[PDB]
Scaffold this active site. Sequence first.
Site, mmCIF file in Angstrom:
data_model
loop_
_atom_site.group_PDB
_atom_site.id
_atom_site.type_symbol
_atom_site.label_atom_id
_atom_site.label_comp_id
_atom_site.label_asym_id
_atom_site.label_seq_id
_atom_site.Cartn_x
_atom_site.Cartn_y
_atom_site.Cartn_z
ATOM 1 N N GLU A 35 16.962 2.459 -1.748
ATOM 2 C CA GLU A 35 15.631 2.701 -1.639
ATOM 3 C C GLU A 35 15.501 4.187 -1.896
ATOM 4 O OE1 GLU A 35 12.963 1.091 -0.667
ATOM 5 O OE2 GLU A 35 13.994 -0.738 -0.179
ATOM 6 N N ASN A 46 2.446 4.101 -4.530
ATOM 7 C CA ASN A 46 2.034 2.831 -5.096
ATOM 8 C C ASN A 46 0.670 2.734 -5.628
ATOM 9 O OD1 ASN A 46 5.023 1.425 -4.479
ATOM 10 N ND2 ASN A 46 4.089 2.007 -2.370
ATOM 11 N N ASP A 49 -1.809 -0.595 -4.978
ATOM 12 C CA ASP A 49 -2.317 -0.989 -3.758
ATOM 13 C C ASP A 49 -2.856 0.352 -2.999
ATOM 14 O OD1 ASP A 49 0.173 -0.256 -2.492
ATOM 15 O OD2 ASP A 49 -0.341 -1.626 -1.014
ATOM 16 N N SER A 51 -0.749 2.450 -1.131
ATOM 17 C CA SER A 51 -0.146 2.667 -0.242
ATOM 18 C C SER A 51 1.189 3.798 -0.756
ATOM 19 C CB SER A 51 0.400 1.499 0.214
ATOM 20 O OG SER A 51 1.487 0.780 -0.575
ATOM 21 N N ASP A 53 5.270 5.064 -0.061
ATOM 22 C CA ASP A 53 6.641 4.648 0.656
ATOM 23 C C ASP A 53 7.166 6.072 1.055
ATOM 24 O OD1 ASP A 53 6.513 1.901 0.294
ATOM 25 O OD2 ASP A 53 7.252 2.073 -1.427
ATOM 26 N N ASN A 60 6.759 1.734 4.114
ATOM 27 C CA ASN A 60 5.372 1.733 3.717
ATOM 28 C C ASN A 60 4.228 2.181 4.825
ATOM 29 O OD1 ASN A 60 2.592 -0.119 2.892
ATOM 30 N ND2 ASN A 60 3.914 0.816 0.964
#
Length: 130
Positions: A35, A46, A49, A51, A53, A60
């Site tokens: 990750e 991202n 959408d 959002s 991380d 998220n």
Amino acid sequence: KVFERCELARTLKRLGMDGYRGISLANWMCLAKWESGYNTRATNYNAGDRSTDYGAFQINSRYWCNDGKTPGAVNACHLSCSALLQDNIADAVACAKRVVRDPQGIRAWVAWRNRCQNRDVRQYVQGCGV
């Protein structure tokens, strides 16, 4: 902060991650590795959408933490996403535990399915003394 492998392994064990909701320590290490590369300041937007991380486990903003600019977002961990960028991983660990309390468990992270599931994950904890 970028953790060294065994340093992180020992820290996670101390925070009670070994066997949490049936998830071995080596799986948590495999997840953090893929990750963020054990980097607590890692962030990834991202665009698809809207959002973001956050942190070592790349949690998220749509479901877990609040950053204020993610549409239709909930804050299940009841934390500012800022808390997931600290060097002290205690808050990020508490939120990670919350994520796996959902039915999906560790499967909530696509990277775990791609890079960790059904693989020999012993290498992530070998020689760390945990």
